[PDB]
Design a protein around this nucleic acid. Structure first.
Ligand SMILES: [K+]
Ligand SMILES: [Mg+2]
Ligand SMILES: [Mg+2]
Ligand SMILES: [Mg+2]
Ligand SMILES: [Mg+2]
Ligand SMILES: [Mg+2]
Ligand SMILES: [Mg+2]
Ligand SMILES: [Mg+2]
Ligand SMILES: [Mg+2]
Ligand SMILES: [Mg+2]
Ligand SMILES: [Mg+2]
Ligand SMILES: [Mg+2]
Ligand SMILES: [Mg+2]
Ligand SMILES: [Mg+2]
Ligand SMILES: [Mg+2]
Ligand SMILES: [Mg+2]
Ligand SMILES: [Mg+2]
Ligand SMILES: [Mg+2]
Ligand SMILES: [Mg+2]
Ligand SMILES: [Mg+2]
Ligand SMILES: [Mg+2]
Ligand SMILES: [Mg+2]
Ligand SMILES: [Mg+2]
Ligand SMILES: [Mg+2]
Length: 484
RNA sequence: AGUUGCUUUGACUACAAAACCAUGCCUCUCUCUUGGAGCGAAUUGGAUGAUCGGGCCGAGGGCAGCGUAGCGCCUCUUCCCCUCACUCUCCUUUCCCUAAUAUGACUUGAGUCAUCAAAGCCUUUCUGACUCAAAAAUUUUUUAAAAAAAAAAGUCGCGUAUUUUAAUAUCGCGACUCUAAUUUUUAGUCAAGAAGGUUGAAACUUCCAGGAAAAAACUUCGAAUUGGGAGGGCGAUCCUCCCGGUGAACUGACCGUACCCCAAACCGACACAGGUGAACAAGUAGAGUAUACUAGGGCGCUUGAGAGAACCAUGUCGAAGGAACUCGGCAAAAUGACCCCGUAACUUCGGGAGAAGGGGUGCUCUCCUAUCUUUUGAUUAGGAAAGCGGCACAUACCAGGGGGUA
RNA sequence: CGGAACAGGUUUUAGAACAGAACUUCGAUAGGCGAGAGGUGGAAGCACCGCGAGGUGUGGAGCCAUCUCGUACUAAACGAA
């Protein structure tokens, strides 16, 4: 056709790729390593691509959080001769801020030419400010835009409102919506969504009934399932049930594209309400919308079923996931691991722990956290020590460090008080020392008295000055300076 | 000296949606590519009930031929297939509607904008996965010891009976497919990044005339300053080994740098048509750095206004003749490019030879060939065949006159 | 002939400068404008035929170095000099 001459089916195979780039980069999987390997193999080749092909590739790589390969492809293909326009420069600015940080994004914006510093680049930098929560520089961009008469779109106002909601100054939203209505700016559905969220955050449930009637009066915005998701979340957190069911049934009517996240929202909202029959009603629709169901829907479903106490249904779902799983997801195991430790059927939890790494799932930290929860409920402390050591050795799955909860630490130390396990208390303190540099809220401030078994340590209040100036209760130093 | 490399390579598609509350352990743990649940229809279905019609099997008495068993004719309705109502829960063929199919809705009219070390190699170094080396772990066999090995699941098939009804399981078997683990340290492979250096900046073949020097620079070894450790030491800060040994948010002094540089600034008495190394130098035509025209960059040459005599310099053209001119074809004219046909006397066999003498050359359409086409169902080069225009198709510029004989 | 002849301006059959000859506003001397002769050879636009290079018609068409005729519009006595 004359509309689209650069067709991807009829194009030459000697010059161009045999399959589209957004199909080629995802051949070996969606993993970071496989995407990087595919990009490295492609950039060394002698086959070429289209500009719209690279644009859709950038959007697909951005849509799954793959920011480094998207930035690398954009930089290399611009270096090879593909000229960025203003829109492509806005997308590249957002990609730079996503990958190398806002300090790199600011330098890219400065090094941009002057005729490229238009409303698209300004709005992209504003969004990259609000997503990184820098209120002062945000407002410094805002008054500069208002001074230079750059057209402020609804996207910028929604970005500021989401920034206000996340920072905690959520009372500014009702002033700002009337500001953007006074400045002749029509809103979108996300404007009503953040307005509703700020109104519910202001402890005002009765205000969300006058906004829905106003957008019904407007007649210009299309209501979407995200609106009803916000209504369902606000009502379920507020305890109202029938209005939440009406919102969720309207949500089910609005989900015409069979969205996986929307189905997850139905499942978790009906699970938090507690209605098992309609939970299974949406679940059968989910199995009718995707036969090869991913592990995320199982992760939601089995957690909902065990929070609604359907344990043999969860056990049959486990066998279904076993017989149809391609990746042995450890979180699926770890849901019923914590289930079997909470209801105490510990032999089957131990069997799953043994059989997971053979089938191909290595243990993360939360399984050991649930087992030390089990051991701190049943009073065995040595096995809680053996669990917390392996938990801090594994650490977090995103590169963080695992730290035990304050309530569990407090209960474990109260258990240490009775048995006079000074060695156990010292090992727990050493573990917390390795975990964190601070180590103290209630950890040892009133907990010198575990030394009241036989003698005490040497330093006499000088060790307690070492760990960054802690302060103890007034009724704690008396048995300390009695024993000197 | 000759070949091969150094010789640039791409995009043009118009696109801010990257701002999200739920569960949250890195919540898409890895989704590239799936028709619809339309209250939508037509043939078909049918989870249903009879009537009418047609059509088997069969049931008896018999007319009929035996000691049981018969061949045609004669009274029957079950049973099947239609038919008329109810009818949407499984199945076949279609049609409408929706979704999906990558965004949105003349100036490459022969251009604009980027790129201008790619590809290798060698030292480190951060982080992942795999093979593991080997040990501790559990089963069998052999005599507490020594040898080999699986652990976890799905699927097909066989024979056989336990419930208070989650019997899709249990009982023994045979086979296929799939995954790699509980603890420990070392190597090695890859993968993905960050620092340096180095090559590309030259390789190969042939030839005879046989193609600089240098404890300067570099690689190696030796010895080693003002450093830190390990074993001796009736000593004296001495012996014997190991590590470091020019390393860095140290430091890098001194001289030149203006301007002209085929020129009005240098060598020629002149602001002199002369002389003055090498490197770079877009486009169209072209074998080409020839030649014509041109953008960028630079310049308009430090005397002008008229008139358009003789004569002089320098060009264009010239009837008929064509060297009759003159010391002499002096000068001028003429030939001139690529492809094809053809090419003598003589000879030291290498040559003469581009001998001499001829023919074609533009443009359009259609075929065929290939171009080692990085947009292959149409773009470039060649050849065939048919046409079109003019006086002229090497149309301007560039560009051998030839032969005979001393 | 006696405010005569010159000079100045527009030119030319004349011409190196000079000189000669024509005209100098009650004036066709030069330019312009219009018409014709002469030269070249069939414009542009439109239409028809052909895939195309191209061909045919409107049409001895279009154009202008010169020459002649008509005409004071411009410059020559716009010298109220
Ligand atoms: K120069
Ligand atoms: Mg030396
Ligand atoms: Mg200079
Ligand atoms: Mg001079
Ligand atoms: Mg001069
Ligand atoms: Mg000179
Ligand atoms: Mg030249
Ligand atoms: Mg110029
Ligand atoms: Mg002359
Ligand atoms: Mg003549
Ligand atoms: Mg002649
Ligand atoms: Mg002749
Ligand atoms: Mg004579
Ligand atoms: Mg003679
Ligand atoms: Mg003579
Ligand atoms: Mg001559
Ligand atoms: Mg000549
Ligand atoms: Mg041809
Ligand atoms: Mg030429
Ligand atoms: Mg007079
Ligand atoms: Mg005169
Ligand atoms: Mg006249
Ligand atoms: Mg005539
Ligand atoms: Mg003409």
């Amino acid at each position: 056709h004359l509309s689209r001459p650069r067709d991807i089916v009829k194009r030459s195979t000697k010059k161009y790729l045999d399959e589209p780039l957004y199909h080629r980069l995802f051949k070996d999987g969606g993993s970071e390593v496989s995407v990087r390997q595919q990009l490295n193999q492609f950039l060394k080749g002698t086959k070429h691509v289209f500009k719209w092909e690279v644009g859709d590739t950038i959007k697909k790589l951005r849509s799954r959080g793959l920011y480094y390969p998207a930035l690398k492809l954009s930089e290399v293909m611009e270096h090879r001769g593909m000229n960025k326009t203003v829109s492509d420069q806005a997308i590249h600015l957002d990609l730079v801020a996503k990958a190398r940080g806002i300090a790199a994004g600011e330098s890219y914006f400065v090094d941009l030419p002057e005729t490229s510093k238009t409303e698209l680049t300004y709005a992209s930098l504003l969004n990259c400010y609000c997503k990184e929560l820098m209120t002062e520089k945000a407002e410094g961009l805002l008054n500069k835009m208002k001074e230079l008469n750059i057209t402020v779109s609804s996207m910028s106002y929604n970005s500021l409102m989401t920034l206000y909601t996340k920072t905690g100054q959520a009372e500014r939203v009702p002033g700002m919506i009337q500001e953007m209505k006074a400045e002749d700016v029509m809103p979108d559905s996300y404007t009503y969504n953040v307005w509703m969220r700020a109104l519910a955050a202001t402890e005002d449930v009765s205000g969300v009934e006058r906004v829905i009637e106003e957008m019904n009066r407007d007649g210009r915005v299309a209501p979407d399932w995200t609106t009803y998701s916000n209504m369902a979340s606000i009502y379920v957190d507020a305890g109202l049930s029938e209005k939440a069911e009406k919102a969720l049934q309207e949500l089910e009517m609005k989900n015409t594209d069979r969205d996986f996240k929307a189905y997850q929202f139905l499942i978790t909202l009906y699970g938090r309400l507690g209605k098992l029959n309609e939970v299974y009603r949406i679940w059968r629709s989910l199995r009718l919308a995707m036969p090869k169901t991913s592990n995320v829907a199982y992760l939601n479903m089995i957690q909902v079923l065990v929070n609604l106490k359907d344990l043999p249904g969860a056990e049959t779902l486990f066998k279904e996931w076993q017989a149809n799983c391609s990746t042995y997801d450890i979180r699926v195991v770890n849901v019923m691991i914590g289930a079997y430790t909470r209801e105490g059927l510990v032999e089957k939890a131990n069997e799953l722990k043994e059989k997971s790494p053979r089938r191909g799932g290595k243990l993360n930290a939360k399984t050991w956290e649930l087992f030390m929860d089990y051991y701190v409920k049943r009073g065995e402390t040595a096995q809680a020590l053996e669990c917390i050591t392996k938990a801090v050795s594994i650490g977090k799955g995103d590169g963080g460090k695992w730290l035990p909860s304050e309530d569990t630490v407090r209960a474990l130390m109260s258990q240490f008080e009775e048995k006079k396990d000074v060695n156990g208390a010292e090992s727990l303190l050493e573990i917390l020392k390795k975990g964190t540099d601070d180590v103290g809220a209630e950890t040892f401030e009133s907990l010198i008295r575990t030394y009241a078994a036989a003698g005490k340590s040497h330093p006499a209040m000088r060790q307690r000055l070492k760990m960054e100036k802690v302060k103890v209760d007034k009724a704690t130093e008396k048995l300390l300076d009695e024993l000197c």
